[PDB]
Amino acid sequence: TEQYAKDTGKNCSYCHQVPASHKSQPGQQGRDQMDCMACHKAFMPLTSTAQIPLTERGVLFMQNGKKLAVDLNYDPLTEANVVKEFARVSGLSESAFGKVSGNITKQRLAYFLMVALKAQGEVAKVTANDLKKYADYTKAASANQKALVWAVKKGYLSARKAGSKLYLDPTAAASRTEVVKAFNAVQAKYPRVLPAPTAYAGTKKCQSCHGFSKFSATWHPNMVKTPDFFGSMLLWSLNDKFQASDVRYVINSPTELLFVGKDYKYMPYAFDKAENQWVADSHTQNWLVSCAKCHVTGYPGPNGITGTPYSVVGNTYKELFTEPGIGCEACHGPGALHAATGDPTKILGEKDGIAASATCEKCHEGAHHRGGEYNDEYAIAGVSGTVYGKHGISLQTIQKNSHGSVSCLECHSQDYRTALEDYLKANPGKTAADFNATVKLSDFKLGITCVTCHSPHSEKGYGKQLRKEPNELCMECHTGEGFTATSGSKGVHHPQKEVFTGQLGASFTALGIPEKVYNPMGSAECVTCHMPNGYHYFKVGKPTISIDNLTIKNDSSLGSYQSRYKASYNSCSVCHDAVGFDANAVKAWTDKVDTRVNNILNQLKTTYAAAYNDPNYKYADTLAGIVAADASHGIHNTALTELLLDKAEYYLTQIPKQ
Ligand code: HEC
Ligand code: HEC
Ligand code: HEC
Ligand code: HEC
Ligand code: HEC
Ligand code: HEC
Ligand code: HEC
Ligand code: HEC
Ligand code: HEC
Ligand code: HEC
Ligand code: HEC
Ligand SMILES: *[C@@H]1O[C@H](CO)[C@H](O)[C@H](O[C@@H]2O[C@H](CO)[C@H](O)[C@H](O[C@@H]3O[C@H](CO)[C@H](O)[C@H](O)[C@H]3NC(C)=O)[C@H]2NC(C)=O)[C@H]1NC(C)=O
Ligand SMILES: *[C@@H]1O[C@H](CO)[C@H](O)[C@H](O[C@@H]2O[C@H](CO)[C@H](O)[C@H](O)[C@H]2NC(C)=O)[C@H]1NC(C)=O
Ligand SMILES: *[C@@H]1O[C@H](CO)[C@H](O)[C@H](O[C@@H]2O[C@H](CO)[C@H](O)[C@H](O)[C@H]2NC(C)=O)[C@H]1NC(C)=O
Ligand SMILES: [Ca+2]
């Protein structure tokens, strides 16, 4: 940026690439040395690193916490700076060059150059007769003698003629020209190659520019380990069937460890983290062939359920993945080219629809692996027809609606919710109401998706990388909020928060229903009944439900998971008895509540009709509309429900009959 230019004193072209048509030839004053923003200010504004991708120096600057890397063209010519750069470019450790101090001399530049070019065997190939071609060669310490002559034969450094003799000047301070000529030879041997569009960079490289250090603690990047990662806490001496050296990989989950042999098949024991013990395990699959495609990152082609993380040379397997675990690029795609340029057009972002659930569903497919079912097509057993998971169609509900507006995407659109939150972060003190002025309903293309409820990047303490406490997550959208005692049937919408918390609001004070009606099933959470065992069907069993997932069933890309389309759970047996509490017992309460609300709404559209304006029939309409819009048949709060129906069956014979 222009700010980084001031902070560093560097030209734009130092960190940013400039078009070929701008390049200065040596001596020439091309556009790459002029004020970019004077000329581009208002004709082709420079706004993005897609226009001006980073040079190597820009990359290093950004990897160094936006501080300049050491540059031998400009910085103090210390032994330290020379080793720092010679090491970086070569990939050697800074220690392979040894102890270091003072400013660089011609003889130790020749030494560092031998290390960096890894030419110790080419330097030992010179003999005492080669050395003697030089008058002052003995004026160099023994370590640097042969190297200084090798460097002069190779032309990296020069000698000088004086009369009939040639001088190396081994103790002269190396000039900037000689350091740079040596650095260029290191750069020639290890040239910086543009990565292919399909190459992967590794999570650690992504973090070196973006940060995201808390990502390293989520379970995604930790799915696959090697045994040394666990130190000595596996208590290997208690394992009588295998040892750490028999193990190729450890499959690492929150509660259990699985172990993968040298032949990639699972091992007879698992490690139970809670009881600190080797237990027996009956997995025998080949992990590489059957499992790795969702557990690793970086192999050619699509990843996830259709992925191929290996190749098989007859009988031996070759691993094609380069990162164990689910790294950044498992969602953002191959990022090596992006990581070498900072070019946003070379990585998957929101502009590519990464927030769509498909980013996650290729591993969380919705059969054995939870999440994907939330937007699938269901055949609920005993109910004819089929139905789509309604969080999936949340947006096209607003698109298909006559009074469909932008205000509604607050709870119906993922790309609206992030767009809005971006506008409040750029224009502080502006509200939700006047962001809607900027956008038409048609701009937005996503309903509710995985990242509406889950963060892909961090765990904030709520479990399952959720953004909020589970109840608060559901209640943020399933609130009515504001509706008063005189709102009526058609004026109270999704009041689940208020019914379930038993808090209808102040204006219900006058009607004798207390400020807080404690819920007899209030020790349950929304997820207890709507998401048993982590299922995202959200359909409640009464008490049990059986679903055939037709999206799973009719998708051959799922392989052997296509046959696992049946889901079955009990929404109530955490508290109610598993066998004794049955559909008949539940149908009793549920019919009995449906009956009582219908006979309040029927005999208020029939007999008491056109009392429509009586502020005494609006009460009995609201009080019975709440039990209807809540749509739980009073299960969300059995005690608030009967106190609502009684105070509504009373308020109808307390009306003016006509
Ligand atoms: C998009 C398809 C996804 C994917 C891949 C996942 N989710 Fe969810 N999720 C939500 C809540 C409240 C929970 C906790 C459930 C509970 O308490 O039992 C979950 C759980 C998960 C899991 C873990 C499942 C388990 O075995 O316990 C996983 C792997 C997962 N999710 C992935 C909330 C929501 C949503 C709010 C309506 C949405 C949308 C999603 N999740 C979407 C997805
Ligand atoms: C290295 C010290 C830099 C110099 C000198 C200049 N830029 Fe820069 N720029 C640099 C980095 C590492 C980045 C990415 C920052 C990020 O976190 O995204 C940028 C970015 C830009 C952009 C993109 C828009 C933006 O991020 O605000 C522009 C338009 C840009 N830089 C312009 C620019 C100009 C005009 C410069 C010369 C005055 C210049 N940069 C120098 C690194 C460095
Ligand atoms: C006028 C004297 C210029 C100054 C100074 C800079 N730029 Fe330029 N730029 C200019 C023109 C007339 C054009 C269009 C013709 C062309 O050569 O393309 C451009 C184009 C660019 C682009 C377009 C993308 C591309 O062709 O690769 C970029 C990214 C660009 N210019 C960048 C750029 C930078 C970084 C500058 C400061 C070093 C700079 N321009 C100065 C005119 C002029
Ligand atoms: C410094 C050389 C970087 C490395 C290494 C990585 N990224 Fe990057 N990224 C960088 C810049 C200067 C920018 C543009 C400014 C910005 O921060 O938006 C980006 C952008 C992204 C994006 C957003 C893309 C978009 O559509 O807007 C993503 C999703 C992203 N980067 C991810 C990412 C990944 C996965 C990386 C490892 C392969 C990675 N980045 C490395 C700079 C640098
Ligand atoms: C394959 C490359 C995956 C993609 C893409 C996504 N997920 Fe994932 N996820 C995957 C595995 C193999 C695991 C188990 C990790 C382990 O070490 O046990 C997970 C885990 C999760 C979890 C559970 C986290 C927890 O606290 O237990 C969640 C909530 C989750 N994944 C969500 C999620 C989202 C939202 C994704 C899209 C942004 C996504 N995953 C993609 C495999 C893969
Ligand atoms: C799937 C489980 C993901 C993995 C692993 C990583 N990212 Fe991610 N990223 C993902 C999604 C679905 C989104 C869109 C977020 C939204 O709510 O719309 C992103 C976004 C980013 C961005 C954009 C800007 C920002 O949020 O700061 C960046 C720069 C980014 N992601 C970088 C990033 C890095 C560095 C990762 C490894 C440490 C990484 N992502 C992993 C999905 C997933
Ligand atoms: C992509 C379709 C996958 C394949 C193929 C395999 N696994 Fe998996 N696994 C996947 C996800 C998305 C998750 C987390 C989300 C969820 O619903 O569990 C997992 C999780 C595991 C775990 C941890 C379970 C736990 O108790 O938390 C284990 C131990 C595991 N997976 C093992 C495993 C094996 C043995 C596989 C081959 C038979 C296998 N997985 C394949 C995604 C995918
Ligand atoms: C969060 C506070 C919401 C806002 C703002 C809007 N809607 Fe919504 N809507 C929300 C929920 C939690 C539900 C389901 C509740 C339930 O009882 O099942 C809905 C549902 C709808 C429907 C479906 C109608 C039905 O099946 O009975 C429609 C047609 C609908 N919503 C439209 C809609 C419009 C037009 C909005 C802007 C005026 C709007 N909603 C805002 C949550 C929220
Ligand atoms: C806004 C991002 C929401 C959050 C967070 C939760 N819900 Fe939701 N839900 C929302 C809408 C807008 C709709 C209906 C839209 C439509 O197209 O009709 C729903 C739907 C439900 C349903 C009905 C599901 C069905 O019949 O298929 C249930 C049972 C439901 N929602 C429950 C629920 C739970 C338990 C939540 C926390 C885990 C939750 N919702 C969050 C909006 C949003
Ligand atoms: C068990 C005591 C439950 C708890 C806790 C919560 N819900 Fe519920 N809900 C439950 C049942 C038995 C039903 C009837 C739906 C059916 O399948 O017949 C519902 C209904 C809903 C709905 C409407 C869904 C629909 O079918 O239209 C919504 C939107 C809903 N529930 C949301 C919700 C919220 C936000 C909760 C926490 C405050 C919550 N439910 C808890 C059973 C139970
Ligand atoms: C533990 C948090 C529970 C969950 C989960 C479910 N139920 Fe429940 N229920 C629970 C208790 C402790 C009681 C008795 C309350 C008392 O103190 O008397 C109940 C009661 C019922 C009833 C009868 C209510 C009445 O006659 O007034 C019904 C019809 C009922 N429960 C249904 C029900 C269903 C269908 C559930 C799954 C969605 C469910 N409950 C879950 C505790 C808990
Ligand atoms: C729901 O969305 C799905 C997206 O993958 C898919 O498009 C699905 O297609 C239907 O599949 C269901 C079973 O899951 C039915 O087979 C449905 O059946 C047909 O519906 C069509 C027209 O609506 C067609 O005319 C068929 O004759 C009719 N069958 C019946 C019930 O008599 C499939 N649709 C098609 C186009 O084949 C989507 N289901 C929907 C939209 O209901
Ligand atoms: C290795 O990878 C293959 C998939 O690409 C197969 O999984 C193959 O399975 C085994 O096939 C061999 C012949 O190649 C035998 O017929 C085995 O019976 C069969 N596996 C089992 C246990 O039945 C895998 N091959 C190897 C070397 O395991
Ligand atoms: C439950 O709801 C009640 C009214 O509906 C009260 O708000 C009650 O709060 C408690 O009130 C009594 C006084 O009558 C005590 O003074 C308690 O200290 C007070 N609880 C606190 C500490 O706020 C509610 N009780 C609970 C525990 O939910
Ligand atoms: Ca799905």
Side-chain angles (χ1 to χ4, degrees), residues 1-40 42-83 85-98 100-124 126-132 134-138 140-152 154-160 162-203 205-213 215-312 314-389 391-424 426-439 441-444 446-468 470-471 473-489 491-514 516-563 565-602 606-617 619-646 648-656 658:
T1 64
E2 293 167 273
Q3 189 54 246
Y4 301 155
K6 282 144 205 165
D7 303 335
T8 61
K10 294 291 171 179
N11 277 13
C12 312
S13 72
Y14 186 77
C15 301
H16 295 275
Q17 293 176 52
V18 304
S21 69
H22 291 40
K23 182 162 168 191
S24 289
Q25 281 302 309
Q28 185 218 355
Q29 280 171 6
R31 286 172 284 178
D32 63 7
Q33 288 178 37
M34 288 169 56
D35 188 323
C36 319
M37 306 300 241
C39 195
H40 283 269
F43 128 73
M44 187 204 278
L46 304 172
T47 64
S48 165
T49 46
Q51 307 166 284
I52 43 168
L54 301 173
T55 63
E56 176 179 29
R57 292 288 155 187
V59 167
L60 299 174
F61 171 82
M62 195 168 175
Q63 299 190 289
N64 278 340
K66 315 221 200 214
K67 303 177 243 98
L68 289 176
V70 165
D71 191 342
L72 297 184
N73 291 324
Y74 300 104
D75 286 332
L77 291 176
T78 74
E79 298 196 332
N81 287 339
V82 176
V83 173
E85 276 294 278
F86 276 41
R88 172 185 71 75
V89 172
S90 57
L92 305 170
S93 176
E94 295 176 18
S95 62
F97 301 80
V100 147
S101 76
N103 297 1
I104 180 91
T105 65
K106 190 151 170 178
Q107 67 179 303
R108 259 177 85 63
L109 173 65
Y111 176 64
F112 294 153
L113 191 59
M114 173 199 65
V115 179
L117 291 202
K118 299 182 307 199
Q120 285 92 337
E122 208 65 29
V123 164
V126 298
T127 42
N129 316 272
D130 285 316
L131 280 174
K132 271 156 184 150
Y134 294 95
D136 62 348
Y137 86 88
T138 73
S142 299
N144 316 327
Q145 279 186 341
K146 339 198 75 194
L148 188 51
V149 181
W150 160 75
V152 169
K154 278 289 173 171
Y156 302 140
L157 296 157
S158 61
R160 37 180 283 267
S164 251
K165 311 233 169 165
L166 297 173
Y167 294 86
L168 304 162
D169 303 298
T171 67
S175 60
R176 179 147 260 128
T177 292
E178 294 181 297
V179 172
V180 164
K181 189 148 174 290
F183 183 59
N184 290 343
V186 180
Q187 277 178 311
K189 187 197 166 67
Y190 315 99
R192 182 165 186 262
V193 180
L194 198 67
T198 50
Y200 286 79
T203 286
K205 184 102 132 78
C206 313
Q207 291 174 313
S208 69
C209 280
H210 288 281
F212 285 64
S213 64
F215 170 82
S216 296
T218 65
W219 283 104
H220 272 143
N222 292 293
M223 177 69 169
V224 178
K225 296 304 187 183
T226 56
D228 51 64
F229 170 82
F230 297 94
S232 41
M233 54 144 280
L234 298 182
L235 308 179
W236 278 108
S237 61
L238 306 199
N239 194 337
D240 48 336
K241 304 216 190 186
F242 58 97
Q243 292 294 294
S245 51
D246 310 305
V247 185
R248 201 181 274 281
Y249 288 119
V250 181
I251 308 311
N252 183 25
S253 80
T255 56
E256 199 167 53
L257 297 185
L258 297 184
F259 296 82
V260 172
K262 295 237 164 288
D263 63 341
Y264 297 95
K265 302 205 186 202
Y266 288 106
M267 308 256 221
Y269 290 145
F271 193 87
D272 186 288
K273 293 181 171 176
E275 70 192 43
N276 222 17
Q277 250 155 62
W278 299 101
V279 302
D281 197 81
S282 52
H283 280 105
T284 54
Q285 305 88 325
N286 186 318
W287 163 83
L288 190 59
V289 171
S290 298
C291 317
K293 62 197 195 179
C294 299
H295 303 171
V296 301
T297 303
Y299 51 90
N303 59 322
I305 190 152
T306 69
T308 312
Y310 65 93
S311 65
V312 35
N315 57 104
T316 64
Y317 295 93
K318 195 199 176 202
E319 304 177 7
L320 295 187
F321 63 93
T322 56
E323 186 179 344
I326 296 88
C328 319
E329 295 162 290
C331 305
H332 295 281
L337 180 56
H338 166 72
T341 66
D343 186 349
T345 67
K346 302 307 193 303
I347 199 75
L348 291 182
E350 95 89 35
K351 72 192 183 297
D352 302 288
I354 196 187
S357 297
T359 297
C360 324
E361 280 166 325
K362 56 213 223 174
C363 301
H364 305 258
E365 84 288 309
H368 281 154
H369 303 118
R370 297 277 55 80
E373 64 266 33
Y374 96 102
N375 61 5
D376 284 0
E377 179 180 18
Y378 317 146
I380 308 174
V383 176
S384 72
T386 67
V387 96
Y388 292 105
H391 292 108
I393 70 193
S394 82
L395 163 93
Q396 84 198 40
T397 287
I398 311 294
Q399 287 170 339
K400 292 164 167 289
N401 234 231
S402 309
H403 0 84
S405 161
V406 169
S407 235
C408 325
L409 311 166
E410 156 125 290
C411 313
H412 287 260
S413 167
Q414 163 64 19
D415 47 341
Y416 171 86
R417 291 165 57 91
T418 59
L420 166 57
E421 134 144 45
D422 279 348
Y423 168 94
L424 307 190
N427 315 37
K430 303 324 241 284
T431 63
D434 69 338
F435 165 71
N436 301 228
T438 318
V439 280
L441 158 75
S442 35
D443 292 342
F444 302 100
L446 293 176
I448 297 166
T449 62
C450 311
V451 299
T452 302
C453 305
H454 299 272
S455 170
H457 296 139
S458 66
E459 158 72 34
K460 299 140 206 262
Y462 308 120
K464 307 306 178 182
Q465 296 178 220
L466 294 168
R467 309 181 174 278
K468 301 173 192 278
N471 279 352
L473 178 84
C474 316
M475 300 188 311
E476 175 204 0
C477 297
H478 299 262
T479 181
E481 175 74 340
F483 76 92
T484 52
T486 55
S487 292
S489 287
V492 291
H493 294 87
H494 28 82
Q496 282 86 19
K497 171 179 184 174
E498 291 77 15
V499 170
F500 175 82
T501 56
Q503 302 190 53
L504 299 185
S507 85
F508 289 74
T509 227
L511 297 72
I513 54 192
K516 217 278 177 61
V517 182
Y518 293 99
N519 182 341
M521 283 179 265
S523 287
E525 298 185 282
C526 318
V527 294
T528 313
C529 297
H530 289 277
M531 305 189 71
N533 299 311
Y535 275 116
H536 290 56
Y537 290 100
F538 294 97
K539 300 291 179 166
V540 197
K542 293 174 292 183
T544 71
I545 189 169
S546 260
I547 309 200
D548 282 10
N549 195 323
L550 298 181
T551 309
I552 303 304
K553 186 185 179 171
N554 303 133
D555 188 352
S556 49
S557 71
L558 300 182
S560 63
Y561 292 99
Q562 193 187 353
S563 67
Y565 55 92
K566 299 172 174 311
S568 215
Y569 51 85
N570 186 324
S571 288
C572 315
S573 56
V574 163
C575 309
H576 294 273
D577 187 62
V579 180
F581 192 63
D582 57 20
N584 289 322
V586 183
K587 259 192 69 54
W589 170 275
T590 252
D591 296 334
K592 166 185 174 293
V593 175
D594 293 329
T595 295
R596 287 182 60 185
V597 270
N598 283 331
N599 308 11
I600 291 180
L601 295 181
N602 284 335
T606 307
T607 80
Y608 301 92
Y612 86 141
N613 234 13
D614 182 13
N616 192 283
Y617 143 113
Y619 293 161
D621 187 41
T622 314
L623 261 26
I626 289 165
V627 182
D630 174 79
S632 77
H633 314 327
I635 295 292
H636 288 170
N637 197 336
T638 53
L640 183 57
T641 285
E642 290 190 310
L643 194 92
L644 278 195
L645 293 186
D646 289 355
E649 293 174 342
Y650 155 93
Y651 265 80
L652 50 68
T653 59
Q654 266 266 331
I655 202 194
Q658 202 100 75

